Homo-oligomer: A and B are copies of this chain.
Amino acid sequence: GNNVVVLGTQWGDEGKGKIVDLLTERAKYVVRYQGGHNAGHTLVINGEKTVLHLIPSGILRENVTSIIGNGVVLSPAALMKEMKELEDRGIPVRERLLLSEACPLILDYHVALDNAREKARGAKAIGTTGRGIGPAYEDKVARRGLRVGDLFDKETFAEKLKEVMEYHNFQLVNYYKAEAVDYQKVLDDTMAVADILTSMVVDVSDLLDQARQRGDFVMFEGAQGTLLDIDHGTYPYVTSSNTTAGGVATGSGLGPRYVDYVLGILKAYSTRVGAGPFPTELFDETGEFLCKQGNEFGATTGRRRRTGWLDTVAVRRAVQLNSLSGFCLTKLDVLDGLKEVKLCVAYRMPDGREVTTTPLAADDWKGVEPIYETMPGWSESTFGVKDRSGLPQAALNYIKRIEELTGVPIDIISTGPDRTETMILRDPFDA
């Protein structure tokens, strides 16, 4: 298929960035359609490590035009810092990055509000990345927020910003008893980069429609993961955007009937960083092992991630919400050496019932217990292996079982962080 979507089937950090960089060899465009700079996608080419946050993962390739769709909430400060660090590494960002004028802006008061609300939550804190993501989406839905297009008229932008900030400062000071945000600082900072942002503007929707008609290869890079979806995720312990495949359309302008192949990124075990339900969470030595061997630490905040076994019940939910075409199993190599590997196949509900579907809201996960299926591990190393043949039999059975429990084929298996430490059993573009 020409239009391929890459997204996380779990709670983020499944290894989307790597797969995007690897697959954009044959793509003309790569599009981010939701989230903002809370995302941290790691790329490792020949040992060199790049960590992107806002800029699409196809930025290192000269043949690809990277696009930030309207679904993304843009921090002008975050972008400039990312653009700079990349330009210093020989990446002509400005030559390959385009963006939507419909993208809402994340300004200082948004970050302030984020911290304030989280402090007001106390123990019930969501555990946001503190980047002002949620507040920026609120201003959008409330129809009071500023977008990239507003930068086009600096006179009226100052009028609009003045009004919005008046509203937010009142609540910051009066309700949250916090420090007000300086209007002039924000006005100066933003205006000091307005021309750079507006020069990269393009009608993303029309462009994507033309690419579709020309048969160009387009890749949509997802942020966060399915269970963090604002609608279908573990509310309220979720991100404020739709992380599921439907977000591709609302966040880029591409008609849903043009999504050809949806590739779900699936890690061999599970992780979650921030508050919220997590049935297969390990607290023992095997947990510390997965964390240590997997190097599980937030690429954006540095928080150590929670680890656990693969949950096929939750994954099956990701299969249906996204109409997954195939999977890309990652971090198989971290499972090396373990005596046995488990995989949750059902949930025991607090009332005694054994279910095979997930609850929705966070409160409904409260007493859920995972029902495992134990499988033999392998001591042999699978790291860097680029052929099924190099995989121990136990690894192959583990892979086949996942396919069995899921009903979706694993088309790509990743065995290391480097771009080349992979094995594409099937290319989504060819399929």
Contact = CB atoms under 8 A, between A and B. Distances in A.
A322 B244 CA distance: 18
A246 B249 CA distance: 5
Contact of A232 (B248, B253, B258, B324): B253
A147 B256 contact: no
B246 A325 contact: no
Given A102-B360, A321-B255, A250 B231 contact: yes
Contacts of A258: 323
Given A245-B256, A247-B250, A236 B143 contact: yes
A240 interface: yes
Most B C-beta atoms less than 10 A away, residue of A246, A257, A324, A360: A246
A256 B251 contact: no
A102 B247 CA distance: 17
Interface in A127-166: 134-135, 137-138, 140-144, 147, 149-150, 153, 156
A145 to B, nearest CB: 8
Contacts of A245: 249, 255-257
A249 B5 CA distance: 15
A51 interface: no
B357 A206 contact: yes
B70 A240 contact: no
A233 to B, nearest CB: 10
A115 to B, nearest CB: 14
A347 B167 CA distance: 37
A203 B359 CA distance: 9
A200 interface: no
Given A171-B171, A246-B250, A232 B256 contact: no
A260 B257 CA distance: 7
For the complex formed by this chain, how many copies does it contain in all? 2
Contacts of A249: 244-246, 249, 256
Given A143-B235, A232-B102, A259-B256, A320 B246 contact: no
Contacts of A248: 246, 256
Given A242-B250, A255-B245, A321-B205, A142 B149 contact: no
B141 A137 contact: yes
Interface string A321-354: 1111100000000000000000000000000000
A182 interface: no
B363 A230 contact: no
A17 interface: no
Given A205-B321, A360-B102, A262 B257 contact: yes
Contacts of A246: 246-251, 256
A142 B139 CA distance: 10
B361 A102 contact: yes
Contacts of A262: 255-257
A266 B287 CA distance: 57
Interface in A188-216: 203, 205-206, 209
11 contacts: A134-B141, A134-B142, A143-B235, A143-B238, A203-B357, A209-B320, A244-B249, A245-B255, A255-B323, A256-B256, A256-B259
Given A249-B256, A255-B322, A256-B262, 14 more contacts: A117-B142, A138-B142, A143-B230, A149-B361, A153-B363, A203-B357, A245-B249, A245-B255, A245-B256, A247-B250, A253-B321, A255-B324, A256-B256, A257-B260
> Which 6 A-B residue pairs are closest in the complex by CB-CB distance?
A255-B323, A246-B249, A257-B323, A246-B250, A143-B236, A256-B256
Interface of A: 70-71, 101-102, 117, 126, 134-135, 137-138, 140-144, 147, 149-150, 153, 156, 167, 170-171, 174-175, 203, 205-206, 209, 230-232, 235-236, 238, 240, 242, 244-251, 253-260, 262, 317, 320-325, 357, 360-361, 363-364
